[PDB]
mmCIF file of C-alpha atoms in Angstrom:
data_model
loop_
_atom_site.group_PDB
_atom_site.id
_atom_site.type_symbol
_atom_site.label_atom_id
_atom_site.label_comp_id
_atom_site.label_asym_id
_atom_site.label_seq_id
_atom_site.Cartn_x
_atom_site.Cartn_y
_atom_site.Cartn_z
ATOM 1 C CA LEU K 1 -16.097 -48.994 76.960
ATOM 2 C CA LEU K 2 -15.052 -51.796 74.838
ATOM 3 C CA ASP K 3 -15.868 -54.171 77.487
ATOM 4 C CA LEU K 4 -19.209 -52.732 78.072
ATOM 5 C CA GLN K 5 -19.905 -52.641 74.412
ATOM 6 C CA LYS K 6 -18.926 -56.241 74.153
ATOM 7 C CA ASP K 7 -21.153 -57.554 76.750
ATOM 8 C CA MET K 8 -23.796 -55.338 75.336
ATOM 9 C CA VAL K 9 -23.755 -56.945 72.063
ATOM 10 C CA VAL K 10 -23.621 -60.187 73.840
ATOM 11 C CA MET K 11 -26.976 -59.561 75.306
ATOM 12 C CA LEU K 12 -28.128 -58.682 72.004
ATOM 13 C CA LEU K 13 -27.095 -61.953 70.799
ATOM 14 C CA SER K 14 -28.502 -63.788 73.746
ATOM 15 C CA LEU K 15 -31.769 -62.248 72.687
ATOM 16 C CA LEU K 16 -31.355 -63.849 69.307
ATOM 17 C CA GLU K 17 -30.552 -67.218 70.655
ATOM 18 C CA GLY K 18 -34.222 -67.975 70.876
ATOM 19 C CA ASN K 19 -34.697 -66.726 67.345
ATOM 20 C CA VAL K 20 -34.734 -68.905 64.223
ATOM 21 C CA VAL K 21 -37.538 -68.442 61.747
ATOM 22 C CA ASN K 22 -38.337 -64.846 60.636
ATOM 23 C CA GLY K 23 -38.451 -63.630 64.292
ATOM 24 C CA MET K 24 -40.435 -60.609 65.014
ATOM 25 C CA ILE K 25 -38.136 -59.560 67.692
ATOM 26 C CA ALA K 26 -35.050 -59.917 65.623
ATOM 27 C CA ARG K 27 -36.718 -57.826 63.037
ATOM 28 C CA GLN K 28 -37.372 -55.125 65.545
ATOM 29 C CA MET K 29 -33.716 -55.231 66.211
ATOM 30 C CA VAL K 30 -33.145 -54.730 62.623
ATOM 31 C CA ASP K 31 -35.372 -51.758 62.737
ATOM 32 C CA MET K 32 -33.583 -50.155 65.602
ATOM 33 C CA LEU K 33 -30.335 -50.801 63.833
ATOM 34 C CA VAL K 34 -31.985 -48.927 60.901
ATOM 35 C CA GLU K 35 -32.691 -46.025 63.186
ATOM 36 C CA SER K 36 -29.208 -46.132 64.648
ATOM 37 C CA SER K 37 -27.459 -46.986 61.568
ATOM 38 C CA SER K 38 -25.484 -43.760 61.681
ATOM 39 C CA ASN K 39 -23.848 -44.954 64.739
ATOM 40 C CA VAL K 40 -23.170 -48.389 63.255
ATOM 41 C CA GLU K 41 -21.503 -46.645 60.397
ATOM 42 C CA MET K 42 -19.321 -44.819 62.958
ATOM 43 C CA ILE K 43 -18.284 -47.849 64.922
ATOM 44 C CA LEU K 44 -17.622 -49.831 61.779
ATOM 45 C CA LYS K 45 -15.344 -47.199 60.362
ATOM 46 C CA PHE K 46 -13.675 -47.528 63.661
ATOM 47 C CA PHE K 47 -13.487 -51.356 62.832
ATOM 48 C CA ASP K 48 -11.681 -50.592 59.571
ATOM 49 C CA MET K 49 -8.648 -50.311 61.844
ATOM 50 C CA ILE K 50 -4.045 -53.073 63.333
ATOM 51 C CA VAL K 51 -4.805 -52.189 59.557
ATOM 52 C CA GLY K 52 -2.091 -49.521 59.665
ATOM 53 C CA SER K 53 0.848 -51.884 60.178
ATOM 54 C CA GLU K 54 0.251 -52.339 56.373
ATOM 55 C CA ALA K 55 1.109 -48.672 55.922
ATOM 56 C CA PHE K 56 4.810 -49.023 57.151
ATOM 57 C CA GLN K 57 6.154 -50.755 53.969
ATOM 58 C CA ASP K 58 3.180 -50.217 51.352
ATOM 59 C CA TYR K 59 3.883 -46.469 51.422
ATOM 60 C CA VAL K 60 7.154 -46.189 53.464
ATOM 61 C CA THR K 61 8.853 -42.826 53.653
ATOM 62 C CA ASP K 62 11.682 -43.533 56.265
ATOM 63 C CA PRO K 63 11.484 -47.134 57.774
ATOM 64 C CA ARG K 64 13.560 -46.025 60.910
ATOM 65 C CA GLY K 65 10.711 -46.482 63.467
ATOM 66 C CA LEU K 66 9.272 -43.171 62.183
ATOM 67 C CA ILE K 67 7.278 -42.075 59.003
ATOM 68 C CA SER K 68 5.846 -38.696 57.840
ATOM 69 C CA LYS K 69 2.154 -38.044 57.859
ATOM 70 C CA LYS K 70 1.854 -37.716 54.158
ATOM 71 C CA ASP K 71 2.615 -41.051 52.187
ATOM 72 C CA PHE K 72 0.038 -42.871 54.383
ATOM 73 C CA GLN K 73 -2.158 -39.658 54.488
ATOM 74 C CA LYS K 74 -2.840 -40.217 50.792
ATOM 75 C CA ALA K 75 -2.324 -44.028 50.455
ATOM 76 C CA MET K 76 -5.312 -46.156 51.545
ATOM 77 C CA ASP K 77 -7.290 -42.871 51.559
ATOM 78 C CA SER K 78 -6.314 -42.634 47.906
ATOM 79 C CA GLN K 79 -8.335 -45.599 46.489
ATOM 80 C CA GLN K 80 -12.681 -45.191 50.867
ATOM 81 C CA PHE K 81 -12.580 -43.891 54.424
ATOM 82 C CA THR K 82 -13.118 -40.090 54.933
ATOM 83 C CA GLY K 83 -9.832 -38.223 55.276
ATOM 84 C CA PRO K 84 -11.367 -36.608 58.385
ATOM 85 C CA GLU K 85 -10.815 -39.940 60.048
ATOM 86 C CA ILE K 86 -7.225 -39.922 58.628
ATOM 87 C CA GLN K 87 -6.654 -36.597 60.305
ATOM 88 C CA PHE K 88 -8.319 -38.324 63.298
ATOM 89 C CA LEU K 89 -5.729 -40.995 62.742
ATOM 90 C CA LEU K 90 -2.935 -38.324 63.085
ATOM 91 C CA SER K 91 -4.233 -37.757 66.575
ATOM 92 C CA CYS K 92 -4.300 -41.520 67.001
ATOM 93 C CA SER K 93 -0.600 -41.382 66.228
ATOM 94 C CA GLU K 94 -0.441 -38.816 69.016
ATOM 95 C CA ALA K 95 1.997 -36.722 66.939
ATOM 96 C CA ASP K 96 5.016 -39.146 67.603
ATOM 97 C CA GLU K 97 8.366 -37.231 67.713
ATOM 98 C CA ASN K 98 6.556 -34.576 65.596
ATOM 99 C CA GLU K 99 5.224 -34.999 61.996
ATOM 100 C CA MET K 100 6.382 -38.589 62.079
ATOM 101 C CA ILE K 101 3.880 -41.482 62.689
ATOM 102 C CA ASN K 102 4.493 -44.262 65.361
ATOM 103 C CA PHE K 103 3.999 -47.901 64.361
ATOM 104 C CA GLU K 104 2.885 -50.830 66.582
ATOM 105 C CA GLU K 105 1.184 -48.725 69.221
ATOM 106 C CA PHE K 106 -1.490 -48.124 66.472
ATOM 107 C CA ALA K 107 -2.220 -51.924 66.390
ATOM 108 C CA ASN K 108 -3.872 -51.943 70.005
ATOM 109 C CA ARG K 109 -6.893 -49.977 68.721
ATOM 110 C CA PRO K 110 -8.388 -56.230 72.031
ATOM 111 C CA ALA K 111 -11.503 -54.898 70.545
ATOM 112 C CA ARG K 112 -11.286 -57.607 67.956
ATOM 113 C CA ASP K 113 -13.731 -59.831 69.493
ATOM 114 C CA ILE K 114 -16.335 -57.111 69.563
ATOM 115 C CA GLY K 115 -16.274 -56.944 65.944
ATOM 116 C CA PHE K 116 -16.668 -60.718 65.869
ATOM 117 C CA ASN K 117 -19.622 -60.308 67.960
ATOM 118 C CA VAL K 118 -21.362 -57.827 65.922
ATOM 119 C CA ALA K 119 -20.425 -59.728 62.905
ATOM 120 C CA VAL K 120 -22.026 -62.746 64.291
ATOM 121 C CA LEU K 121 -24.983 -60.723 65.063
ATOM 122 C CA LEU K 122 -25.197 -59.611 61.549
ATOM 123 C CA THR K 123 -24.616 -62.786 59.867
ATOM 124 C CA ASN K 124 -27.096 -64.365 62.149
ATOM 125 C CA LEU K 125 -29.601 -61.673 61.533
ATOM 126 C CA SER K 126 -29.238 -62.602 57.988
ATOM 127 C CA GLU K 127 -30.299 -66.021 59.043
ATOM 128 C CA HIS K 128 -32.798 -65.395 61.700
ATOM 129 C CA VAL K 129 -34.946 -63.499 59.234
ATOM 130 C CA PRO K 130 -34.188 -65.071 55.927
ATOM 131 C CA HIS K 131 -34.794 -63.989 52.347
ATOM 132 C CA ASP K 132 -35.200 -60.237 53.174
ATOM 133 C CA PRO K 133 -34.287 -56.768 51.852
ATOM 134 C CA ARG K 134 -33.689 -53.970 54.368
ATOM 135 C CA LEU K 135 -31.753 -56.258 56.526
ATOM 136 C CA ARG K 136 -29.259 -57.079 53.825
ATOM 137 C CA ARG M 1 -4.251 -70.188 27.008
ATOM 138 C CA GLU M 2 -5.021 -66.700 26.130
ATOM 139 C CA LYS M 3 -8.575 -67.011 27.348
ATOM 140 C CA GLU M 4 -7.275 -68.769 30.362
ATOM 141 C CA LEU M 5 -4.894 -66.291 31.567
ATOM 142 C CA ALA M 6 -7.050 -63.493 30.592
ATOM 143 C CA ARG M 7 -10.113 -64.638 32.435
ATOM 144 C CA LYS M 8 -7.857 -65.372 35.356
ATOM 145 C CA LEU M 9 -6.823 -61.794 35.513
ATOM 146 C CA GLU M 10 -10.397 -60.848 34.928
ATOM 147 C CA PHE M 11 -11.507 -62.397 38.125
ATOM 148 C CA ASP M 12 -8.472 -63.298 40.139
ATOM 149 C CA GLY M 13 -5.649 -61.061 39.117
ATOM 150 C CA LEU M 14 -3.104 -63.581 40.217
ATOM 151 C CA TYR M 15 -0.190 -61.633 38.921
ATOM 152 C CA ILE M 16 -1.704 -58.676 40.808
ATOM 153 C CA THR M 17 -2.098 -60.996 43.705
ATOM 154 C CA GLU M 18 -1.752 -64.786 43.794
ATOM 155 C CA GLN M 19 1.414 -64.991 41.845
ATOM 156 C CA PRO M 20 3.199 -68.133 40.989
ATOM 157 C CA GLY M 21 6.827 -69.024 41.717
ATOM 158 C CA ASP M 22 8.335 -72.284 40.134
ATOM 159 C CA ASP M 23 5.328 -73.520 42.259
ATOM 160 C CA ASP M 24 2.016 -72.932 40.411
ATOM 161 C CA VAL M 25 4.335 -73.884 37.562
ATOM 162 C CA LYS M 26 2.478 -72.907 34.490
ATOM 163 C CA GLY M 27 2.638 -69.404 35.240
ATOM 164 C CA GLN M 28 6.425 -69.087 35.428
ATOM 165 C CA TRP M 29 6.741 -68.686 31.610
ATOM 166 C CA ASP M 30 3.469 -66.860 31.725
ATOM 167 C CA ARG M 31 4.758 -64.051 33.843
ATOM 168 C CA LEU M 32 6.734 -62.490 31.088
ATOM 169 C CA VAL M 33 4.034 -62.704 28.440
ATOM 170 C CA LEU M 34 1.817 -60.083 29.947
ATOM 171 C CA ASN M 35 4.414 -57.503 29.509
ATOM 172 C CA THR M 36 4.170 -57.797 25.800
ATOM 173 C CA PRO M 37 1.801 -55.631 23.814
ATOM 174 C CA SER M 38 0.581 -58.518 21.819
ATOM 175 C CA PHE M 39 -0.530 -60.756 24.728
ATOM 176 C CA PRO M 40 -4.043 -60.622 23.644
ATOM 177 C CA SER M 41 -3.141 -61.985 20.225
ATOM 178 C CA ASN M 42 -6.486 -63.654 19.379
ATOM 179 C CA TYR M 43 -9.051 -63.425 22.238
ATOM 180 C CA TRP M 44 -11.492 -61.249 20.242
ATOM 181 C CA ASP M 45 -12.091 -59.128 23.351
ATOM 182 C CA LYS M 46 -8.539 -58.035 22.992
ATOM 183 C CA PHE M 47 -8.781 -55.084 25.355
ATOM 184 C CA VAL M 48 -8.900 -56.833 28.550
ATOM 185 C CA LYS M 49 -5.746 -55.365 29.949
ATOM 186 C CA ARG M 50 -7.439 -52.037 30.298
ATOM 187 C CA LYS M 51 -10.226 -53.745 32.274
ATOM 188 C CA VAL M 52 -7.650 -55.204 34.427
ATOM 189 C CA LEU M 53 -6.215 -51.781 35.245
ATOM 190 C CA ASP M 54 -9.918 -50.824 35.617
ATOM 191 C CA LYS M 55 -10.424 -53.269 38.412
ATOM 192 C CA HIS M 56 -7.173 -54.278 40.116
ATOM 193 C CA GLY M 57 -5.553 -50.947 39.335
ATOM 194 C CA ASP M 58 -7.466 -49.014 42.027
ATOM 195 C CA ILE M 59 -6.029 -51.265 44.742
ATOM 196 C CA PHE M 60 -2.608 -50.331 43.502
ATOM 197 C CA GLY M 61 -1.182 -47.673 41.284
ATOM 198 C CA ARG M 62 -3.449 -47.199 38.359
ATOM 199 C CA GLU M 63 -0.268 -46.714 36.303
ATOM 200 C CA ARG M 64 1.762 -49.174 38.455
ATOM 201 C CA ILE M 65 -0.447 -51.933 37.060
ATOM 202 C CA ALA M 66 0.243 -50.285 33.688
ATOM 203 C CA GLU M 67 3.883 -50.509 34.636
ATOM 204 C CA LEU M 68 3.130 -54.175 34.784
ATOM 205 C CA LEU M 69 1.122 -53.876 31.577
ATOM 206 C CA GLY M 70 0.383 -50.875 29.315
#
């Protein structure tokens, strides 16, 4: 899915390769991204993630290859992301041993470049259709 | 110096973040001074520390920065 998503956004960029000045077509892309912005919000909160390797000493509660789902349950959550996606993150930990959270296997969710891609798309949308509101 | 360090924390928070060692030399003596109550001796916005907890404190402990400060 990541692959597919990657090449997908690639086409979306290839579409923009012709674009420079306030492109009509790029703007229509902006508009669809307006319509689908819910989904962009979803995928991006997925992009908030390898982030959790930070959790293993910032809020450590064992440092023996294991940590309880509590000090990191109210760490970074205690300053942005919905805690629903932290409980989602407990499933991402796959309940290692039991309450304890596994470490490096979190870092795989690779996909990095996708985010580069969309980022490029964004930053370039900022440029393809310059000096504009809804876009930014 | 007061304005200096203070505005530095106001925007950069280097002791929250980009801390000096003996490198970034000026700050080595300057580490200790923040701890003191009377750091803002004469800046005439002498309340800045609480703005500092107001901004950089959310990233960390709100009172852990106060542990550094107030």
